[PDB]
Amino acid sequence: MTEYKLVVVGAVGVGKSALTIQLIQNHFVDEYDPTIEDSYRKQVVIDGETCLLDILDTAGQEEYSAMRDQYMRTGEGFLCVFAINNTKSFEDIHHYREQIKRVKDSEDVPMVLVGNKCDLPSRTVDTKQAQDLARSYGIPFIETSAKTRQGVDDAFYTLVREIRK
Amino acid sequence: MDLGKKLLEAARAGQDDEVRILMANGADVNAHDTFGFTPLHLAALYGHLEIVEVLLKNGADVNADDSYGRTPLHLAAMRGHLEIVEVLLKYGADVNAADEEGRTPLHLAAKRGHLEIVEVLLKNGADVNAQDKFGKTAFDISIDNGNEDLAEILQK
Numbered sequence: 178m179t180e181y182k183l184v185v186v187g188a189v190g191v192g193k194s195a196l197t198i199q200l201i202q203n204h205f206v207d208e209y210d211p212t213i214e215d216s217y218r219k220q221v222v223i224d225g226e227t228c229l230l231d232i233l234d235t236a237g238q239e240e241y242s243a244m245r246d247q248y249m250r251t252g253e254g255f256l257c258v259f260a261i262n263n264t265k266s267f268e269d270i271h272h273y274r275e276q277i278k279r280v281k282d283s284e285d286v287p288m289v290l291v292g293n294k295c296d297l298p299s300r301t302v303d304t305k306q307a308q309d310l311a312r313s314y315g316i317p318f319i320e321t322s323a324k325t326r327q328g329v330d331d332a333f334y335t336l337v338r339e340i341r342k
Numbered sequence: 343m344d345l346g347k348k349l350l351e352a353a354r355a356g357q358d359d360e361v362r363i364l365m366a367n368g369a370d371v372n373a374h375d376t377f378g379f380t381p382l383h384l385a386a387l388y389g390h391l392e393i394v395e396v397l398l399k400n401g402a403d404v405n406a407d408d409s410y411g412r413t414p415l416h417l418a419a420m421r422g423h424l425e426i427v428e429v430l431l432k433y434g435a436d437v438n439a440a441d442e443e444g445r446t447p448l449h450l451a452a453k454r455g456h457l458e459i460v461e462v463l464l465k466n467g468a469d470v471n472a473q474d475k476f477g478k479t480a481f482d483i484s485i486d487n488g489n490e491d492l493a494e495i496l497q498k
């Protein structure tokens with residue numbers, strides 16, 4: 178069965194770990210420690226092909242990581258996560274996309290833009306602004322809620338579909 | 343009064359004074375957040391040796407595990423906190439403890455490239471050949487990463 182090395186990137190507190198745990202464990206976490214960088218795995222069925230997900234949930238980017246750099250060189254898809262209530266996280270997408278382009282040495286890498294915490298009533302980051310950025314990058318944009326599971330499978334599924342292409 | 347939260351925070355932040363005081367007023371060394379981190383997990387993860395010891399000496403559970411099955415030893419290995427790994431063992435940490443994926447501390451250290459910790463775990467009776475629930479072992483991880491120095495340790 179096929180293995181996909183997925184990298185989850187984005188600013189601290191956007192809900193990367195909360196997304197990873199909702200996908201693999203089917204449970205929401207409030208409080209998950211913000212510097213634990215682990216790679217969780219998950220067997221799924223995507224479009225009739227049993228396949229294995231090997232997801233790195235980046236944390237602690239402040240400090241250096243041997244295994245994080247190795248995941249970045251080798252990784253196959255990227256989830257670029259921002260929070261819909263954090264304008265700084267949206268701005269940081271620019272730096273993450275550019276960093277991926279440089280480590281991978283390629284204008285075209287499998288990527289999905291994720292606007293997390295869409296379960297939330299107040300929203301500082303407009304749907305059009307996010308859709309325009311994804312449309313300028315030529316990549317899908319998916320709204321997600323790690324709390325309600327909305328769009329969570331879709332985000333990880335679409336990325337696997339983008340690697341197949 | 344919720345001194346469990348006040349103790350966890352203190353353990354993470356490396357405030358050995360606040361930890362001493364908090365326990366003196368009967369704060370529970372096996373408090374845990376909504377994902378099962380004990381003060382020991384946090385101290386280990388964040389590299390706080392004096393705090394790790396004072397927690398253990400005060401009866402903290404060394405083989406406590408979070409809701410993904412990780413012991414404090416797992417986390418100490420994860421980060422490459424060598425002197426902590428040793429004292430966790432000296433106080434009875436299970437070397438071959440397996441998280442929800444079946445990974446032992448050897449897998450995690452091997453995977454991060456923490457070779458000094460791999461050497462020490464093996465010396466305390468780590469099982470070189472244990473498979474996680476997807477079949478992988480330390481040696482699978484060395485080949486999967488092209489890590490030459492690790493694959494060497496795992497033979498001669």
Ligand SMILES: Nc1nc2c(ncn2[C@@H]2O[C@H](COP(=O)(O)OP(=O)(O)O)[C@@H](O)[C@H]2O)c(=O)[nH]1
Pocket residue numbers: 188189190191192193194195196206207208209210211236293294295296297321322323324325
């Ligand atoms: N309402 C809501 N809260 C979330 C969501 N995702 C994460 N959070 C919360 O935001 C905090 C940060 O999540 P975390 O996974 O630590 O993000 P990370 O720091 O990127 O790994 C936690 O308290 C989560 O409960 C979401 O989709 N909706």
Ligand SMILES: [Mg+2]
Pocket residue numbers: 193194195209210211212213234235236
């Ligand atoms: Mg996190």
